[PDB]
Amino acid sequence: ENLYFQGMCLSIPSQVVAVDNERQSVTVDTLGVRRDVSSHLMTEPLAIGDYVLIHIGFVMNKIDRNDALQSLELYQEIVSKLE
Amino acid sequence: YFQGMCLSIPSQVVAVDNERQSVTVDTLGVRRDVSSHLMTEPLAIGDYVLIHIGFVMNKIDRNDALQSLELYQEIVSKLE
Numbered sequence: 001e002n003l004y005f006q007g008m009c010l011s012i013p014s015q016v017v018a019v020d021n022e023r024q025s026v027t028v029d030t031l032g033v034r035r036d037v038s039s040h041l042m043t044e045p046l047a048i049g050d051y052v053l054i055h056i057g058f059v060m061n062k063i064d065r066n067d068a069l070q071s072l073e074l075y076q077e078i079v080s081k082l083e
Numbered sequence: 084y085f086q087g088m089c090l091s092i093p094s095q096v097v098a099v100d101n102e103r104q105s106v107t108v109d110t111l112g113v114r115r116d117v118s119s120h121l122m123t124e125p126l127a128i129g130d131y132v133l134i135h136i137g138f139v140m141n142k143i144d145r146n147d148a149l150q151s152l153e154l155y156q157e158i159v160s161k162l163e
Contacts, residue, residue, distance in 0.1 A: 002141045012152075012155050013143060013147075013148035013149075013151060013152055013155075026140070028140075031152075031155065031156070031159065037084065037137075037138050037140075038084040038086075038137055038138070039140070040086075040135065040137055041135070041137045041138060041139040041140065042139075042140045043139065043140065043141055043142070044142060046140070046142065049145070050142050050145070051142070051143055051144075051145050051147075051148030051149070052140040052141060052142055052143065053140070053141045053143055054138050054139070054140050054141075055138070055139050055141075056136070056137075056138060056139070057136070057137070057138075057139035058121065058134040058135055058136040058137065058139075059121050059122075059123050059134070059135055060108075060117065060121050060122050060123065060126065060132040060133075060134055060135075061123045061124070061132060061133050061134070061135055062123070062124055062126055062130055062131070062132055063093055063131050063132060063133045064131075065129075065130065065131050067093075068093035068095075068131035068133075069093075069131075071093060072093055075090075075092055075093070075111070076111065079111065
């Protein structure tokens with residue numbers, strides 16, 4: 001699963017070349033092209049010289065139910081306005 | 084970073100299967116099953132969640148990565 005960046009594209013092992021934990025970012029090199037990326041979804045702490053496989057994904061964060069319920073009316077109005 | 088391009092929609096947990104370790108969420112009427120391992124903290128039925136999208140990174144063994152990269156390079160030389 002972790003091999004697939006998305007369903008029809010193989011992740012390329014990428015070397016970690018910089019780590020900035022105070023700014024939650026890491027720089028990776030993928031076949032020589034460098035990209036700085038947010039490190040919020042790294043699955044364990046990383047260091048220079050580690051190799052990673054990367055995929056677009058997500059994690060689920062809880063939100064207070066009352067805040068969710070109050071905000072949802074605005075989300076529905078947006079959908080109504082833009083569909 | 085690209086999470087900055089969209090607003091996560093509050094989504095209700097509408098089913099929980101602990102034998103499969105999955106949950107179902109509902110986002111304005113549309114339901115999806117998601118792995119429970121993706122919870123950042125304990126969720127229960129009826130809770131609301133917001134996803135955080137981004138690049139998930141899995142560390143792999145350096146030697147495996149380095150040996151495989153010859154094959155990636157070979158594909159690139161051939162296609163691109």
